[PDB]
Amino acid sequence: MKMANHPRPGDIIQESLDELNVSLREFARAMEIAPSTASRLLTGKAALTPEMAIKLSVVIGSSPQMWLNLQNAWSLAEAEKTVDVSRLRRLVTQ
């Protein structure tokens, strides 16, 4: 999968923090999460979960689904490497 148009969830969050002039620990405090948890989220060492999507919607903005959409692109790219659809065919009315 070409990721050219699929930004890293963590990068988008960091980009937002840069525009707001907010530090990692201030972001962590605002999200009521530990600094370590915030770091993993920003660096991508931890996937953006539904729980995090809800918190991000409040603290940063946009909707929980928007944040999950960002993560789905990468989760889909990973799954693609392990899923075999080479023999699958679209079902038609029987």
From Swiss-Prot:
SUPFAM superfamilies hit by this protein: lambda repressor-like DNA-binding domains (SSF47413)
GO molecular function: DNA binding
Signal peptide coordinates: none
Ranges of residues in domain HTH cro/C1-type: 13-67
Keywords attached to this entry: DNA-binding, Transcription, Transcription regulation
Keyword RNA-binding among UniProt keywords: no
Matching InterPro entries: Cro/C1-type_HTH, Lambda_DNA-bd_dom_sf, Toxin_antidote_HigA
Portion annotated as DNA-binding: 24-43
Keyword presence, Membrane: no
GO terms of biological process kind: regulation of DNA-templated transcription
Annotated family: Belongs to the VapA/VapI family.
Protein name, UniProt field: Uncharacterized HTH-type transcriptional regulator YddM
Originating organism: Escherichia coli (strain K12)
